[PDB]
Amino acid sequence: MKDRKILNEILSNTINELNLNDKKANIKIKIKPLKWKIASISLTNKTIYINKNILPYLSDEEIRFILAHELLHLKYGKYHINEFEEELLFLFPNKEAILINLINKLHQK
Amino acid sequence: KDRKILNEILSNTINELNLNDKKANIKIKIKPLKWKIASISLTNKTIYINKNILPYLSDEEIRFILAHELLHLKYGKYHINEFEEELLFLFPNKEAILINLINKLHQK
Ligand SMILES: [Cl-]
Ligand SMILES: [Zn+2]
Ligand SMILES: [Zn+2]
């Protein structure tokens, strides 16, 4: 139902808003069923995999947040440093009070 | 309870969503569904809920899952704008609900 064309548009808009440099900007997105993960990234395949099973629950704004969180790890590394938090709060201002709980709950065991 | 509480939550969500029109036709089945949470057969008015994750669902999580499925009876199989708005009105926190549920199920 949720086509790869809107998904690719959301990814491209989030990369642009985050001003990801040339190599960090070379990322694909693909729909694949996952194992209790909203999203994951294959750093070698240079692909963000969004879970096919939970994709019907996701609004465009929810996808944008999930992709921004993942994309910001490409830019800043594996930790939620101050610059990570600031950039995510700039893209999502009305999420100040829930931001850290959400990003912490997006990491696997 | 457990199966009784699910039936109570289904009946309360149908009423809340104003889908009282042929509530008796709305059925729910517990079946193992791999890594899916739920599905709905619109032609048979049957909701399928994953047996594997059902023990770990809170009343609020069940309510959200069932409301999502029941909204397909009202708007059709596509998540049109009205679907999204209604679900966001009932669950202003639906983004956190889903993220905390997936995290909980992964840990479990
Ligand atoms: Cl089925
Ligand atoms: Zn749906
Ligand atoms: Zn993170």
Swiss-Prot record, chain B:
Top-level taxon in the UniProt lineage: Archaea
Transmembrane segments: none
Pfam families documented for this protein: Peptidase_M56
Family from the record: To M.jannaschii MJ0123 and A.aeolicus AA15.
Protein name: Uncharacterized protein MJ1213
Organism of provenance: Methanocaldococcus jannaschii (strain ATCC 43067 / DSM 2661 / JAL-1 / JCM 10045 / NBRC 100440) (Methanococcus jannaschii)
Source taxonomy: Archaea, Methanobacteriati, Methanobacteriota, Methanomada group, Methanococci
